[PDB]
Enzyme design. Sequence first.
Site, PDB file in Angstrom:
ATOM      1  N   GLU A   1      45.065   8.831 -19.685  1.00 41.81           N
ATOM      2  CA  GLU A   1      45.570   7.740 -19.862  1.00 41.81           C
ATOM      3  C   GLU A   1      44.736   6.407 -19.996  1.00 41.81           C
ATOM      4  O   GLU A   1      44.510   6.297 -21.635  1.00 41.81           O
ATOM      5  CB  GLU A   1      46.836   7.089 -19.053  1.00 41.81           C
ATOM      6  CG  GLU A   1      48.019   7.988 -18.599  1.00 41.81           C
ATOM      7  CD  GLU A   1      48.697   8.303 -20.131  1.00 41.81           C
ATOM      8  OE1 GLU A   1      48.669   8.174 -21.134  1.00 41.81           O
ATOM      9  OE2 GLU A   1      49.611   9.038 -19.825  1.00 41.81           O
TER      10      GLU A   1
ATOM     11  N   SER B   1      55.252  -0.638 -29.694  1.00 40.32           N
ATOM     12  CA  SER B   1      54.992  -1.050 -28.451  1.00 40.32           C
ATOM     13  C   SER B   1      53.940  -0.855 -28.308  1.00 40.32           C
ATOM     14  O   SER B   1      53.200  -0.029 -29.065  1.00 40.32           O
ATOM     15  CB  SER B   1      55.550  -0.074 -27.557  1.00 40.32           C
ATOM     16  OG  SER B   1      55.345   1.476 -27.638  1.00 40.32           O
TER      17      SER B   1
ATOM     18  N   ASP C   1      50.691   0.361 -24.604  1.00 40.52           N
ATOM     19  CA  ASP C   1      50.952   0.096 -23.666  1.00 40.52           C
ATOM     20  C   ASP C   1      49.957  -0.443 -22.457  1.00 40.52           C
ATOM     21  O   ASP C   1      48.703  -0.553 -23.583  1.00 40.52           O
ATOM     22  CB  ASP C   1      50.559   2.134 -23.756  1.00 40.52           C
ATOM     23  CG  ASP C   1      51.323   3.331 -24.168  1.00 40.52           C
ATOM     24  OD1 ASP C   1      52.477   2.420 -24.382  1.00 40.52           O
ATOM     25  OD2 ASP C   1      50.773   4.413 -24.091  1.00 40.52           O
TER      26      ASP C   1
END
Length: 129
Positions: free
Chosen positions: A35, A50, A52
């Site tokens: 990630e 959006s 992250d």
Amino acid sequence: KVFGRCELAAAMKRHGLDNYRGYSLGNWVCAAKFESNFNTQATNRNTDGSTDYGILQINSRWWCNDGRTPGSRNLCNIPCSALLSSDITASVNCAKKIVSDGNGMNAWVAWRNRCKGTDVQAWIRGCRL
């Protein structure tokens, strides 16, 4: 902050992620690796607008407020910026809510595609824990 592998493993353990909802520490370290490459300041914009945030790339659509994701929720009750801190407390706490949501660590698509079913214990091998 860019954590070392074992440094992160130690931090996640101290914050109670080891075996949380049945996911061994290596799972969490693996997910963080893919990630964010262990960088607390990692951000990435999604096609839907959006964003992250942080070591586990937690999404503003549901989990945090960033003021710029229309129609979104803030279920972890935090500003998304808290997910970029050198102190992983907010990311871990919010990850506990996410992984409890029904789909387990499948919530992290990178975990499903790159960690699930693999020898995740490799990620904590050699570490003092």
